[PDB]
Amino acid sequence: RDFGRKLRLLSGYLWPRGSPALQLVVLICLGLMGLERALNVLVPIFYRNIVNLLTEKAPWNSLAWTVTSYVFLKFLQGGGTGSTGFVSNLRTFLWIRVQQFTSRRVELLIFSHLHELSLRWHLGRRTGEVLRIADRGTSSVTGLLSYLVFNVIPTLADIIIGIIYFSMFFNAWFGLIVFLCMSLYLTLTIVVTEWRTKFRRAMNTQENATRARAVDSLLNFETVKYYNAESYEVERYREAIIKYQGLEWKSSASLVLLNQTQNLVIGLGLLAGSLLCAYFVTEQKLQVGDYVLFGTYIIQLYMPLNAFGTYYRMIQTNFIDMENMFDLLKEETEVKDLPGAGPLRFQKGRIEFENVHFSYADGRETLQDVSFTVMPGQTLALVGPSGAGKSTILRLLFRFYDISSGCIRIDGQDISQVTQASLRSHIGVVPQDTVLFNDTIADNIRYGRVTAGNDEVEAAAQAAGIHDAIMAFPEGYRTQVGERGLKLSGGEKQRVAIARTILKAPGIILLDEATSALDTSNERAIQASLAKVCANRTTIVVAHRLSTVVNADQILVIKDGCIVERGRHEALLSRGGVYADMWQLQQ
Amino acid sequence: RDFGRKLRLLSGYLWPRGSPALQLVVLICLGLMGLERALNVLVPIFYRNIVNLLTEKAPWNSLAWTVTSYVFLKFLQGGGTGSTGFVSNLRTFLWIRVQQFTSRRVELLIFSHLHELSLRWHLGRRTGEVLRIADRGTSSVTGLLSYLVFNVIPTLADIIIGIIYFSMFFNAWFGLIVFLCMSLYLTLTIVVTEWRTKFRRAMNTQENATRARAVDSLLNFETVKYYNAESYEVERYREAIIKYQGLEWKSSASLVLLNQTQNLVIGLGLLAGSLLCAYFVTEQKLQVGDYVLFGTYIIQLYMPLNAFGTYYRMIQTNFIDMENMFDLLKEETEVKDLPGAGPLRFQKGRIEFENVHFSYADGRETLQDVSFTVMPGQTLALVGPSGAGKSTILRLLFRFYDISSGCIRIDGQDISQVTQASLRSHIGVVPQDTVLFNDTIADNIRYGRVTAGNDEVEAAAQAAGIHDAIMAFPEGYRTQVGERGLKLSGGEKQRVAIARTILKAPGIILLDEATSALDTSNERAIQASLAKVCANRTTIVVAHRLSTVVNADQILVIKDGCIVERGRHEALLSRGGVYADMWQLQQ
């Protein structure tokens, strides 16, 4: 069953592996834990000893030596109540190393997973939820591991010794009944604990949303301030707390009732034997004062079984709380690299389609019967009314989603066979919407080729028509862009983005509605420079202002998921089709 | 004594305020704690008497009655160490209600103080810091309110009893000596810890930036997948762990040294006491065994002081964490209402500028001597090369920032006097870059006037032009736009907002940049339908695509922080000014 798989994987990250130095530190700590109880029991023996020594009034040397030994061992024991003693503390301080290892490995695991799911799962997420799961997750493991070694192993070993012992002290068969009693006690408390899982699960899956209403709301500050707000949002946030309030108060209370009902049954189970002894005593059939054995008997079962019960609840809570993470760690990727493939041989660069169809949700065909080819060194442009499907034709060629029928070829090879890691090398895009890392421009613009020196980056942004404005800034390049990169400007953000790709100097360039959001003037230059410095030719560019693709080699028009009519500029203008109407309306 | 001020705010929310029902639950819990201690001490006396009276002979139902009473007394006892008794659990379960109250009244506080800071602080934040610093704060308060009810108060009360008691048992002046000795002990243990506190702030600050790498990276998938990564992002993420990891190492060890070394003082003190006792016993005056009396006296000084000390370090840690939290509350709004402000009177919406000067950080002038007036019912259009500062002029009229000289008047009235709460109600704005809440279209487009019903919103979006394309979607008005609304489309993401403002129906409108994404055709229709709404309402529109403002009422050109030339389209073109150059190059 499932429990199997979970545990197995869990086998590794629980027990330190591969680093023998941290392999050993668990054992020393375990052994010191073992030594602690023995020392605690041993100390009173020497206390009694010194007592008698005192009694006889022995010479000062022997009594002083015994005093020194006693104080030595009392210091090493630590003194009971708070275990605030040497041998006890050394455990914690030598534990603070192995815990850090297993806390690092879990967290730096799932993070390396969130950057490999396909783009669809990214768009569909809700940032609050995914941000929270990691927080509750890692705490679960770092709690389980620091809880399994201190308590469960010692108690279990002690009780198994207790059952192995006393077998010869009583009859030979006495061990079997004790083992069966322990097993039967265990199996009874299992069925009763299913009263908990439903409420904990409800808590948890309702807590995630009440995080989403926070981080989602705070994320877009400008929208909540433009329209009048700040009294709708606080109110709505409160009304999501009360639900979580009520749903907790059931789960927390349901623990205490289960705790008391566990205790009471054991208490009256022992009271039955006590009343049996009372019946035997008082001259009913005997006056035996055998309470010496019975009084010892109640503790030796009251401690271990209640202790064993009150921990199994803790472990059950920890797994049911963990349960949510496993999912974000098993949702497999989508687009997949066909096992066994290599780099995509690269030549001057020729891309072609043939008979591609693609649908987002099977409700309707987003793209039907697309077919177009481009020769190296030429420029191909798309123009269409909003939503017709300009963005998707470009977004497929970079292989986020996956084709349905037909095929896409780069320079004579399919893209399905070639590994996807290489395909990202030669293709550079500038996105429809730009985002920036919250860091200074100098670090942000070099991000394409980390090796690049501090002169070439200056050379690149100069060709992008942005350099002359930046130097006039106060503080120079050390200026900070600010969160999500809107503090900088309204348009210069686009120019920074367009410099990013120029730095990388890829093979093929896929500008997308890039020239917009600028001004009619600077555009001419960006284009001109981009041209001279066009890197490797083969460029596809989707733009709306027709005054920027007038001289492109080939032009396409997309009405709805299908090519309408194609040609060059002057030749297609006289045709008098829809493109003619767009141009005429664009005065 | 800033500590003086800080405390109040603590006293405000710790002890329940204003709610007598949750006022009472503190006293019941405290009293139950006390009676728990009383039961724990009382039971053995009961047990000893029952054993003695049962021991001899001859019970007549008295043994049974006493045994049953004993069993229930044990049931209420809880058996000491485990606290698994009907008294101990009642404490926790009646503690759940009051704690949750404090946990709420803190978290909902700062969330309503985090939507009132002005815009500049927001553009300067790091989402990691602000999202984390709340989580630590809302844990510190509920943690601190645990100790000052369960642990510290009982121990302090016990010390007060122990010092008032034994005053008749010994000389009266003894209590003064004991009090002075305890104060002297406390005086040293403060100085030893304060060395530690300058060594936790480094940990806590260093954690913030590490959180900054996570959320800020995960906040933009596109820019980390378009180029190649996961061989740089993970690698850099590890580094911001190792630094943190080592810093925690160097901290949490300092607790162990400064917890053991305190013990060694007490151990040496007890060694000195025992050695003096032995020297006195060894026939110095007599073989009197005074050690039995002395040891109990010594343990009296031992435990009510070691316990007092070891509950002084947790308090210090808790105030370090709250110390990092308070700073977010002390910050003040950059702009604040002038006290005693009357709501604005709105007649026709004429707006007037008078010699405004404004800069962001005193490095350079951003706007110089702007002067323009528009009468009601007209259209003003700004056109100029990027970075000149049209966006700032638009952002200023809404009172986000504040002016430096001169004033701006709305309907012949200053805006320095009127409270900002009224001003934002009349004005409608569609932003430069759109954002969306992660919820269905029906929720985002409705957000303008929550009262408005399902009919008016449907009628409204028709004027926008989005209506036809929506129903072609599967699921209609209940589709999901996903996080930050980049799943919808490229163009429609603006048409939604341009419907939102129409729904609010303000007095005056400030379209920042409508026709950037929308294509050419859908434009003409949106412009025509927008005019049909009402010719009376005044609008400010700033558009790079120069076609859309051909026939506006009057036009301004901004070169750099200053007006250049003003006039209507037909007359100004013949002037042959810079506007002529822009238009001619555009054609």
Ligand SMILES: Nc1ncnc2c1ncn2[C@@H]1O[C@H](COP(=O)(O)OP(=O)(O)O)[C@@H](O)[C@H]1O
């Ligand atoms: N992730 C998605 N989820 C739902 N619908 C989508 C998604 N991506 C694209 N679409 C649909 O496909 C169309 C894509 O058109 P697109 O080429 O983006 O238009 P534009 O060129 O204006 O950006 C949109 O109209 C949208 O309805």
Ligand SMILES: Nc1ncnc2c1ncn2[C@@H]1O[C@H](COP(=O)(O)OP(=O)(O)O)[C@@H](O)[C@H]1O
């Ligand atoms: N929040 C800010 N902090 C500092 N400087 C800013 C801020 N916002 C804008 N600026 C500077 O002031 C100018 C504002 O120009 P803006 O009106 O945004 O130009 P555009 O309209 O072309 O986007 C920009 O050049 C930018 O350098």
Ligand code: VO4
């Ligand atoms: O706000 V702009 O950079 O499009 O003038």
Ligand code: VO4
């Ligand atoms: O909405 V667009 O057709 O400019 O990608």
Ligand SMILES: [Mg+2]
């Ligand atoms: Mg702007």
Ligand SMILES: [Mg+2]
């Ligand atoms: Mg698009």
